[PDB]
Structure 1
Amino acid sequence: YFEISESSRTQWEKPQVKESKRQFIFDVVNEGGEKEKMELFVNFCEDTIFEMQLAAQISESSILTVRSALFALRYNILTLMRMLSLKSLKKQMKKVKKMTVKDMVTAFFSSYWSIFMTLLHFVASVFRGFFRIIC
């Protein structure tokens, strides 16, 4: 049991050292023998220790598109749901008392048609916003 320093841990977890470790493991497994396995491992350890010490020594001294997409979603869905929010559905309901099965099927289809229209509006808004952002 021994001590490991946080600086050593950070330098080991640097991606450069991880790539070096992967290359070393690949080389040892493919073009390396068992007789020299430990010797090669110690050489790699020494080189890695030196480079991490040097790295510590020298060290010691999209969002717009996402926001536009959420704004387009919020705005378009609010426009769609203002349908329900208007509360003016009473004059439709006066004849909802008097619908037929034909009419209720028509309303069922119209709901999905409105949803698809809102999706088209949302896609168009996203394209316009992306064009404005890149411009």
Structure 2
Amino acid sequence: VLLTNLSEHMPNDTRLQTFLELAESVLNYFQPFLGRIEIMGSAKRIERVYFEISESSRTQWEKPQVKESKRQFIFDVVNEGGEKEKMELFVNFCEDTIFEMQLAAQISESSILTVRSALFALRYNILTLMRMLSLKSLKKQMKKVKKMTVKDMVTAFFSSYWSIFMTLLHFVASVFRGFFRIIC
């Protein structure tokens, strides 16, 4: 807190900057627990205030129901509220939230299968496609197409994508079978 106050009130001091890199680890550790606010101080002057925020406090504030309460409060003050009582409403909401947080802290005492099936089917079908594609039959294909034979090259070109489409159909059928098995 001392170092953060000094850094924020001495923004152009390299001598303090060096201390900041030296204390980078401690400051990084304490960043979640350090809370900063600004107030209109006793000297008719705006002042920074640094305080401690508890881990339990942070968790209870980040609880989803507290977030829903915050959203409802913001909606209420923005739509059905004025600037005269805005801070009064904010303080009342803060008090209610603090009480709920404290009560929750007191009372707090202490899919994958279908993904696996789809992955296994992908593996099996693509492995079958790779097995049928990569073979010693290239010599037989050459023996068919000795010469140029644009017709043969185009036929093989279309056959490759037909095989890809058939593999996709087999994979889709396997996925459907797996889904039926898991639901039954």
**Normalised-by-shorter TM-score class:** over 0.9
User: What is the distance in 2 between the residues matched to 1:16 and 1:9?
Assistant: 14
Bigger helix share: 1
5+ long unaligned stretches in structure 2: 1-49
Q: 2:51 is paired with a residue of what secondary structure?
A: coil
Structure 1, 75-84 or 23-32: larger mean CA deviation:
75-84
- Which of 119, 132, 135 is equivalent to 2:181? 132
Q: CA deviation at 1:17?
A: 0.2
Structure 1 position 86, deviation (Å): 2.8
Q: 1:102 Cα shift?
A: 1.0
Using the TM superposition, name which of 37-46 and 53-62 deviates more.
53-62
Higher RCO structure (Cα 8 Å, ≥6 apart): 1
Name whichever of 90-99 and 22-31 sits farther off. 90-99
Paired residues in the alignment total 135
Q: CA deviation at 1:99?
A: 4.5
Higher mean C-alpha displacement, 78-87 vs 43-52 = 78-87
- Cα drift, residue 90 of structure 1: 1.7
CA distance in 2, matches of 1:129, 1:61: 39
Residue 61 of structure 1 and its aligned partner are, at CA, apart by 3.9
The structure 1 residue matched to 2:82, chosen from 27, 33, 36, is 33
Unaligned runs of 5+ in 1: none
TM-score by length of 2: 0.71
When normalised by structure 1's length, the TM-score is 0.95
Secondary structure (helix, strand or coil) at the match of 1:35 reads: coil
> RMSD between aligned alpha carbons?
1.1
| Per-residue deviation, 1:4 | 0.4
**SS of equivalent to 1:2:** strand
More strand by share: 2
Is 1:100 matched with 2:149?
A: yes
Displacement after TM superposition at 1:92 (Å): 1.3
Q: 1:57 aligns to what SS in structure 2?
A: helix
Which deviates more from structure 2 when the two are superposed, residues 84-93 or residues 8-17? 84-93
Residues 54-83 of structure 1, C-alpha deviations (whole Å, 9 max, x = no match): 000110341110000000000000001102
